[PDB]
C-alpha cells in the first residue's frame, strides 16, 4: 500500500488496481467529455 | 446508410454527396468565461480563464 518511486504515478499496487477496475462501458456521458479533448 | 449518430442522439458523421468520403462532425469550441479578481477593494487588474 505504500507508494513506490519505480512508477510515474505516486500510487501503490492496490491504488492502481482500484483505478483500473472502476470504469465505464461507453454507455454514458463522462467518458465522452470528462476523460480525454473533444467536447 | 447516410449519416451517423450515437447514444447521445446527435449527428457526428455524414456521407459527402459529392465524393465517397467519411467525415466526422465536431461542434465549435465553446465554454464559460471565468474572471479571476483579487477584489475591487485591493486592485483593478483581473485574469480571464
Ligand atoms: C492544441 O493545439 C496544438 C497546436 O499547436 C496541437 O498541437 C494540439 O494537438 C492541440 N490539442 C488538442 C487537439 O487536444
Ligand atoms: C476596504 O474598503 C473599505 C471601505 O468600505 C476601506 O475603508 C478599507 O480601507 C478597504 N480595505 C481593507 C479593509 O483592507
Element (H or E) spanning B48, and its range? strand B47-48
> Solved by what technique?
cryo-EM
Resolution for the entry shown, Å: 4.5
Residue B39 C-alpha, separation from nearest chain A C-alpha, in angstroms: 31
- CA nearest neighbour of B11 among B19, B23, B21, B20: B23
CB B13 within 8 A of CB B24: yes
Cα–Cα distance measured from residue A11 to residue A23, given in angstroms and rounded to the nearest whole number: 18
Q: Is B29 on the interface with A (CB under 8 A)?
A: yes
User: For A12-17, which contacts have Cβ atoms below 8 Å and span 24 or more sequence positions?
Assistant: none
Q: A29–B30: do the CB atoms touch at under 8 Å?
A: no
- Do residue A27 and residue B7 have CB atoms under 8 angstroms apart? yes
Amino acid at each position: 500500500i505504500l507508494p513506490d518511486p519505480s512508477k510515474p504515478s505516486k500510487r501503490s499496487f492496490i491504488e492502481d488496481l482500484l483505478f483500473n477496475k472502476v470504469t465505464l462501458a461507453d454507455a454514458g456521458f463522462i467518458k465522452q467529455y470528462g476523460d480525454c479533448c473533444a467536447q | 446508410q447516410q449519416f451517423g449518430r450515437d447514444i447521445a442522439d446527435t449527428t457526428d458523421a455524414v456521407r459527402d454527396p459529392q465524393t465517397l468520403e467519411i467525415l466526422d462532425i465536431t461542434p465549435c469550441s465553446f465554454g464559460g468565461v471565468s474572471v479571476i479578481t483579487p477584489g475591487t477593494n485591493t486592485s483593478n487588474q483581473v485574469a480571464v480563464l
